[PDB]
Amino acid sequence: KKSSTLQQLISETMVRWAQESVIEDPELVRAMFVLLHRQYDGIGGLVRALPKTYTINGVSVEDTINLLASLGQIRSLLSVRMGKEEEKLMIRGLGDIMNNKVFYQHPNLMRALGMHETVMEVMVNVLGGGESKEITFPKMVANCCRFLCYFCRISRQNQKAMFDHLSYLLENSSVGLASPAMRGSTPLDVAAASVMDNNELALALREPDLEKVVRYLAGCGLQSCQMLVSKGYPDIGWNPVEGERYLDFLRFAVFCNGESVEE
Amino acid sequence: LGVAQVGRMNFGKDVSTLKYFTICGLQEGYEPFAVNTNRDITMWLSKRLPQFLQVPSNHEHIEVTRIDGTIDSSPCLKVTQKSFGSQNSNTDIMFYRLSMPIECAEVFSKRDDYDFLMQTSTYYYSVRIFPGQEPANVWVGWITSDFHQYDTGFDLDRVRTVTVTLGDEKGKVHESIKRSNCYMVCAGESMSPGQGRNNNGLEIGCVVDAASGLLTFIANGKELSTYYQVEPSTKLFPAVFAQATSPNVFQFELGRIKNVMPLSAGLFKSEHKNPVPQCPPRLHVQFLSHVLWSRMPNQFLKVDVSRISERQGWLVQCLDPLQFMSLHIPEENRSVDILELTEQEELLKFHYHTLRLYSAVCALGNHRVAHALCSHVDEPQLLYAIENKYMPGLLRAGYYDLLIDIHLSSYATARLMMNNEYIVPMTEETKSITLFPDENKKHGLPGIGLSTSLRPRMQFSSPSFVSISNECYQYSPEFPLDILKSKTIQMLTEAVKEGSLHARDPVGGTTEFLFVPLIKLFYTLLIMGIFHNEDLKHILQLIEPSVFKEAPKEGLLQMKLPEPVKLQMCLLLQYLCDCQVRHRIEAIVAFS
Amino acid sequence: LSKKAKASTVDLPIESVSLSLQDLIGYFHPPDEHLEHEDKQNRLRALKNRQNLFQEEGMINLVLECIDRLHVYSSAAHFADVAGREAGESWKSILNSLYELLAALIRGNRKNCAQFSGSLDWLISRLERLEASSGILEVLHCVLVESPEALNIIKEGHIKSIISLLDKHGRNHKVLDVLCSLCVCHGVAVRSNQHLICDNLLPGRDLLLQTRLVNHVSSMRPNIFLGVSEGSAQYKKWYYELMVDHTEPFVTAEATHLRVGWASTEGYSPYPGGGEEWGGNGVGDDLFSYGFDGLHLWSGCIARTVSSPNQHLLRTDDVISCCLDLSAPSISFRINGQPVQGMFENFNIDGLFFPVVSFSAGIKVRFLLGGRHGEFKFLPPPGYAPCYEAVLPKEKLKVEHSREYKQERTYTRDLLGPTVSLTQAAFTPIPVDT
Amino acid sequence: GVEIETISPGDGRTFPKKGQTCVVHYTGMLQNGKKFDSSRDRNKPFKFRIGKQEVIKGFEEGAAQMSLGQRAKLTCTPDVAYGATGHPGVIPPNATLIFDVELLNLE
Amino acid sequence: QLILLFSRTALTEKCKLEEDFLYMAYADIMAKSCHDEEVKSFEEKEMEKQKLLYQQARLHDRGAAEMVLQTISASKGETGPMVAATLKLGIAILNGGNSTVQQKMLDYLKEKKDVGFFQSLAGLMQSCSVLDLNAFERQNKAEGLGMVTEEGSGEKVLQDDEFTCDLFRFLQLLCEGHNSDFQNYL
């Protein structure tokens, strides 16, 4: 009989092409074999699609459309070099996303869309391209950290999802530590909010992660603050401003829900 | 064809038209030249009208030497006769010109001083006739782009000229304008004393006032009586017409005189305020030549001529529109049909890279740059480039990519980025969705159906450059999407019909050039989702008729496609599979 | 040598440097394409290791130092004046070899391209020099493709210098490729670079080849050939009219073309002179033809606005009467019987003149040639004769294409060679001197 | 400072007024003769409201002095069209614009 | 062609072995095909052995052993799903002490003088996990306070038992049958 089905037709076409010619293009070979695997693994398509499937009521359709448009703008800003106009657009998109009610009402959709990962890599771009050469675009780092702290506070599962990015955040836990008016807007603040008042996550905290913070605090206790002495502050031997903020994260790591995590 | 000779060439596109092919040519196995072709062969003929082209390095008569400009010497371009004093030398007047023109002002206003040098619009170049070369055989001055007069006997009296005399109502001529393509003087008449060249090379100096259009000539430091007045916006090319009486003929000196700017400033915009004379590599000597081909158009205007009556005279009637895509060379003030670039390789390559730069400057949602580019490349130009069958393959691909990037890429990328997410509202339309269209468990055609999953909103902005608003810059420029759909469908149908015959004349010259741009535009439209119902049915019939028959012409999948075409058919099949997955997800949500 | 020491006493290893540069380029030659995958991978690994070792030993700075100390001399003649004549001969070759070596050292190496950012500003400053432009451009392209830090450091001045390279050196596709690489690298677009390139290149419309759609324009002429010569049996004054039965102002996005007037031939050849057979050119687009579109007088592709009562573009039911005076060169027009306050004068009369109309699609016009070939709507000006009076006694007047090729089947198309000169157009009676 | 050539006459009676929309087809050309904008190319009539500062002032009064059904040539000096800054990417600085404008309808 | 694509991808120069979904899918497909699994007859046992040998030949005739060695070598001692799939495919093609596969694997290594293969093997062994009292006690405390377990297996303790077992089973199959040459080569 004839193929009568798209899956059968695709399988026959790929097999026939491959056995007809020795394909010189590795991209063509890869595409054909991916398509063949998709035809023979139709279950896997559902397995990958259903976790990304969300249903909403009719009343929330307009708000979901607006939030999706904002998320699309933010996602499309990933393919452009970060500048002043890009910073403004990303900030306004984030602001619209906070102001949207769906962000609060449906944390599961918000997590399924991978908004936290998008804002994470947006912050990663600037951190990599402008931590060592002084913090360029500080407003982006502050806004991204504020968004990520609100994301953690929305739901416990969002906090657990952000807990998986702890190692990178603790690596970049020296971005805006000495600068004021950025309290609650630094990667250390996001790291603290990823573990704040969660016994399971506090227990899941490892020893090397705490060792990293202890080393940072020892460095702050030994060496003065370069940016403060550049602005002209008197040169004392140690760094109270950064030391206090590291001590705050250690406090949040060791104390949970009125009790002390002994481990 | 010789003088008064009439002939006809038959390429045997229609084999029946060949008179003697059957008796001789057919049995021996010879094939008609145009046997496996779908469209008429483009015929190139010898150009009657000579054009200015750069002197070849292998030219057997003329050699051009670019003498560098030292501190004490101006940059020089020396034209010499290679084969002089030997047999076969051409003792005919040779017309020379410089590549770039001086452009007069749009509106004519009614120790060197630096302020004067900066505020002046007067430019100067000089020509040195070497000793031993008769100045009566040498002419110096300016010409326009309209100059195409190749006569072995040239004199200033025979130059083409016209005097437009605009008059008032009662008849007074309030202005009279002389127009010509040759504003030049003879060095022989400038040599009044005589022996002005033998002791030292005769030195004609050409002075042009771009602000007033006044052309004055100075010879050996004294100002000649002959002068010219040109109209505003006239483009004047430095030109020397000389008949060689010496191995060394003349020299293009690019120097400057007191209170006058060198030619380089008026030629080049970057050097507008640079009093030091310059001879950039762009400036080169060109000569009038007859070795050039001309491309006969594939189609001509259909015009009917007949005698209505003795009283009514002869009727001339043209009613069917016909257009061609014209490529303009800026510095030479010339225009050629873009279809000619099948034989000018350097222009074709430069224009393909220009199209690539156009596609790159507006890449990744640069909507303001796309709006700006809509001025340079208009939608009728894009449509003509997309549909034309005689277009070069490189330009075809470039224009397809330009159309996609300017008008479709942003929304296509947004939909591709939101593709793997299924946010479906729970409405009556969603609840009505089922896995199978009817009781028979037979899959419906992919794409066709009712999909309620949320999708990005498609918005476009009108590209108008007379408004002063700024909200229009966001959103991609608007395009006639329905016309694009219909033309893409008909092109795909024609390509499917023609490619099965394996013609030796595919659009663009290769099967890849024929299919890859068309299939790419088709895939972009499909991803955007502009196609709806019956259009998608025609699409599925074209792709694979037997499988997608709705409840022997072969489709694309079994047409022996190249690897690049296969790579895009894989993308199309991938999108169809994604559509099926989305339909399954929506049916599951409906059951839930 | 720069310290003005004697050339003879100082040693300059010209031949050794040239041979080592050739050997070094061979050392850093990239793997060839026809090789197998494993061999190509091994060669690529060896090349990468060589580049890394050279960069760690800082040979790029040494090459830059040699290039800088060679650029102090502006020409091979200058270098042969300072150093030896052999050095002057080899100066250009050594510069080219050094630039090729730099390109080979930094090609495909992300770390080397990132370290060359500090020197990129130094590199672009010599882009204008003709002896190093190609090498500098190749190095710039190699750095821009690999390193994003290069795009970060590139600024408006560097972009304007790159564009001035096109402006001064002419059309070069490599500069366009460099500009393309300046916009997007590794899938990330630099919007500032895009905006700068657009705003500094596109609006000029003087370097890139401009493109437009032009309506096809055809010209139609009668058989009559009108010329003036000394002692010739030809009348100097002629008159004809054009009837505009219908015209559509916009059949397409471009305005409809409709021009009427007189045109002349080059010499005595019957073929119209000065114009191309096909294209968008019509009456008045060259210095051999003279036109009137209802609002302007056209000659040499230049239009001047001419006044007229109720002046307008040629519309339906318009009468255009064209007068040609060959005794004193003059072409005058009268629209709808009213004089047009403008005329062509003092043109070249060494040729044959004929009536001509140029048009695009969307017209319907009628020639009124006088007599039984059209009835004049208005009386001819005194002295002027109808154009039907110029037909030779045996020939028959007809209106045909001005050019020899028209729309027809290809195999039925009559290809035409050069036509004979129409010397018998002007009958000059020359008696035999006796 | 708008130079008005008439190509085709209009009724000469129905001029645009305050608070009216003008429906026009226009073709924009630089002084050198190069087209930069055309509503006929897009095949859509252009609409603007008199006195709302929606278009450049040269084009504004150029259409205002016109009549219904009139085809006119509008020459806008740089002081009434984009100034010395120009339009980025389309109109160069200090450019004089020529417009072929037809007043199709007033509504 | 697919096995050659995988081999070329493994032989291409990368700093890290990127995860390839096509590879994880097709390596699993090939591994399952090569094994396809109360007293039974001797003829039945021989038929099973011959069918297993034919299924393994279906792959190692097309270059599967070289590809699975190349992937392990390119892994550079980094534990991952790619390495786990490669080890499973190697075990599938090496089950039963397949002498032809052992000879092909030894000959390829001897010809190419591959040091990265053994370096990656040592790195993978060093990266293999063990029992963790600290993690087990933290999990027990988390259950004592009664929080819901995200995973009940406590996989943080003994992170990759299957990966460690597959890694050592691959090396055991490499020496099955008293293969003295490869025993000395290791």
Author numbering:
A (entry chain A): 2053 to 2315
B (entry chain A): 1207 to 1316, 1414 to 1854, 1889 to 1929
C (entry chain A): 436 to 869
D (entry chain E): 2 to 108
E (entry chain A): 3666 to 3702, 3710 to 3858
Provide excerpts from the study.
Ryanodine receptor type 2 (RyR2), an intracellular Ca2+ release channel located on the sarcoplasmic reticulum (SR) of cardiomyocytes, is essential for cardiac muscle excitation-contraction coupling. Structurally, RyR2 is a 2.3 MDa homotetramer consisting of two functional regions: a massive cytoplasmic region, also known as the cytoplasmic shell, which comprises several regulatory domains (NTDs, NSol, SPRYs, RYs, JSol, and BSol domains) and the stabilizing subunit calstabin-2, and an activation core and pore region, which comprises the Ca2+ binding site and the transmembrane domains. Dysregulation of Ca2+ handling, characterized by aberrant SR Ca2+ leak, is a pivotal pathophysiological mechanism in a spectrum of cardiac disorders, including heart failure (HF), atrial fibrillation, catecholaminergic polymorphic ventricular tachycardia (CPVT), and other arrhythmogenic disorders. Here, we solved the cryogenic electron microscopy structures of ryanodine receptor 2 variants linked either to heart failure or inherited sudden cardiac death.
Moreover, by analyzing two different mutations at the same residue, we were able to determine whether the identity of the mutant residue differentially affects the local and global structures. Recombinant human isoforms of the PKA-phosphorylated CPVT-linked RyR2-R420Q and RyR2-R420W channels were expressed in HEK-293 cells and purified as previously described. Calculation of RMSD normalized projections showed that the RyR2-R420Q had more pronounced conformational changes compared to the RyR2-R420W, but smaller than that of another CPVT mutant channel that we previously reported, the RyR2-R2474S. However, the mutant channels in the primed state revealed that the NTD-B is rotated relative to the NSol (2-4°). In the mutant channels, the NTD-B domain rotates and separates itself from the CSol and the NTD-A- domains, weakening the inter-domain interaction and promoting the primed state. In WT RyR2, R420, located in the NSol domain, interacts directly with the NTD-B domain. In RyR2-R420Q, mutation of R420 to the smaller residue Q420 results in the loss of both interactions made by R420 in WT RyR2. In this case, disruption of such interactions results in a 0.7 Å downward movement of the loop formed by the residues 298-304, which contains both interacting residues R298 and V300, leading to the rotation of the whole NTD-B domain.
